[PDB]
């Protein structure tokens, strides 16, 4: 029971970190280069 509630704490920590992390242009810049050259 201590271990199951302890992994419940684990799950809480991991959902908090997921919510935390919840918070392409290179080719178009080459296109930007084409015109000037």
């Amino acid at each position: 029971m201590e271990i199951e509630k302890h992994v419940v704490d684990f799950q809480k920590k991991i959902i908090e970190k997921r919510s935390n992390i919840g918070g392409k242009q290179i080719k178009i810049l080459e296109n930007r280069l084409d015109k000037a050259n």
């Binding site: 178009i28 296109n31 930007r32 084409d34 015109k35």
Partner: protein, 420 residues
């Protein structure tokens, strides 16, 4: 020769260009199919005449609609510069994020059409000042072509925000943003407005069921009459540069109002006579202009007239002499013989005469001031701003555009009354 290239912009400019090409085909005897049944057209194997007309826009529904209507085969399938997102009535959209990635497709195609000729005497732009695409995209094309080609003459048949209502809520912002980048790099801005166009198709012409194709036909007949003195013979011919000289005495006051004639009722088209004194009456009549600025509330810095049809030159001489004689102080007197006159030797399709009056006068300054007024109103109170400010533009440029408009108009007004 003495070429023209017809770049378009916005749905407005696209429709106007479509109908202008319709008019010039129907005048030069060109079908919608592109045959004859080079000053404007190009030769193509199989006996075809392709108009060197580029249609650029940020939306293709306009492109599709102009392709769909008659005379669509004129434009060849490369000059349809396709935009997919649309600036959505945002000068920032139409000038910075989508400009700086459409510039160069347009550059390749305009170099295409420019090397296609030998001597490109002048350009041709028709666009808007209020629509995001039209305004931003168009003034950006103007800046670019004036960057590489400094020897040509720039010319915009420009529609402005309407007086009684603004067509799009940010008409003032887009309009001041267009004029701020128009003044220095656009050499002849023919100022047109949808409302005055409505007035001229309504009042003396019986038109009770108008349409956008109709206004396009009107302004395109005018647009053909302004230059028809070029591709045709005449006892006294001109061009874009004799006109530009006789029109601008200063590089700034170069924005022009235009009118074309004749235009009368049709049910009454038989009761009236049809003479050149009547042509003078017709357009020196105040109401016949295509701008929401009666020029007799100001002064004529100068004015040019271009005839079409074969009558005498005694005519044009007594013409500008008589008109100067009575409406003298309606002009400006600090400049001698401020009316220039030329003759094209061919009359219009089916009629007897045509006349085109162009005017470098100081009555569009109030148009500019009303634009700046609407701008400053929405501007201090910050109306409709994040659409411009969240796309890499700052209101420092808005302030400078407004102040630059005001500077232009301050010269306009003081040159109205400057005498010595």
């Amino acid at each position: 020769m003495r070429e023209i290239v017809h770049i378009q912009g916005g749905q407005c400019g696209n429709q106007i260009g479509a109908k202008f090409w319709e008019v010039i085909s129907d005048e030069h005897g060109i079908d919608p199919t592109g045959t004859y049944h080079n000053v404007y057209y190009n030769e193509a194997t199989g006996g075809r005449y392709v108009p060197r007309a580029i249609l650029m826009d940020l939306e293709p529904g306009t492109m599709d609609s102009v392709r769909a209507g008659p005379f669509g085969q004129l434009f060849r399938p490369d000059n349809f510069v396709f935009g997919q997102t649309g600036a959505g009535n945002n000068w920032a959209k139409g000038h910075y994020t989508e400009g700086a990635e459409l510039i160069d497709s347009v550059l390749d195609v305009v170099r295409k059409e420019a090397e296609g000729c030998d001597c490109l005497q002048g350009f041709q732009i028709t666009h808007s000042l209020g629509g995001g695409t039209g305004s931003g995209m168009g003034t950006l094309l103007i800046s670019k072509v004036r960057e590489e080609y400094p020897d040509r003459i720039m010319e915009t048949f420009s529609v402005v925000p309407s007086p009684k209502v603004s067509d799009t809520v940010v008409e003032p912002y887009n309009a001041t943003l267009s004029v701020h980048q128009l003044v220095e790099n656009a050499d002849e801005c023919m100022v047109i407005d949808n409302e005055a166009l409505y007035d001229i198709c309504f009042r003396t012409l019986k038109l009770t069921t108008p349409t956008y194709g109709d206004l396009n036909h009107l302004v395109s007949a005018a647009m053909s009459g302004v230059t028809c003195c070029l591709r045709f013979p005449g006892q006294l011919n001109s061009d874009l540069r004799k006109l530009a000289v006789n029109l601008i005495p200063f590089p700034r006051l170069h924005f022009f109002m235009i009118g074309f004639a004749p235009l009368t009722s049709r049910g009454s088209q038989q009761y009236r006579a049809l003479t050149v004194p009547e042509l003078t009456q017709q357009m020196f009549d105040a109401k016949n202009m295509m701008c929401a600025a009666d020029p007799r509330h100001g002064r004529y810095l100068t004015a040019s007239a271009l005839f079409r049809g074969r009558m005498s030159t005694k005519e044009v001489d007594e013409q500008m002499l008589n008109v100067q004689n009575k409406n003298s102080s309606y002009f400006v007197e600090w400049i001698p013989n401020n009316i220039k006159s030329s003759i094209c030797d061919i009359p219009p399709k089916g009629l007897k005469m045509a006349v085109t009056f162009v005017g470098n006068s100081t009555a569009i300054q109030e148009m500019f001031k009303r634009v700046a007024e609407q701008f400053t109103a929405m501007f201090r109170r910050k109306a409709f701003l994040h659409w411009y400010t969240g796309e890499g533009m700052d209101e420092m440029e808005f302030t400078e555009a407004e102040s630059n408009m005001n500077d232009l108009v301050s010269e306009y007004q003081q040159y109205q009354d400057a005498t010595a």
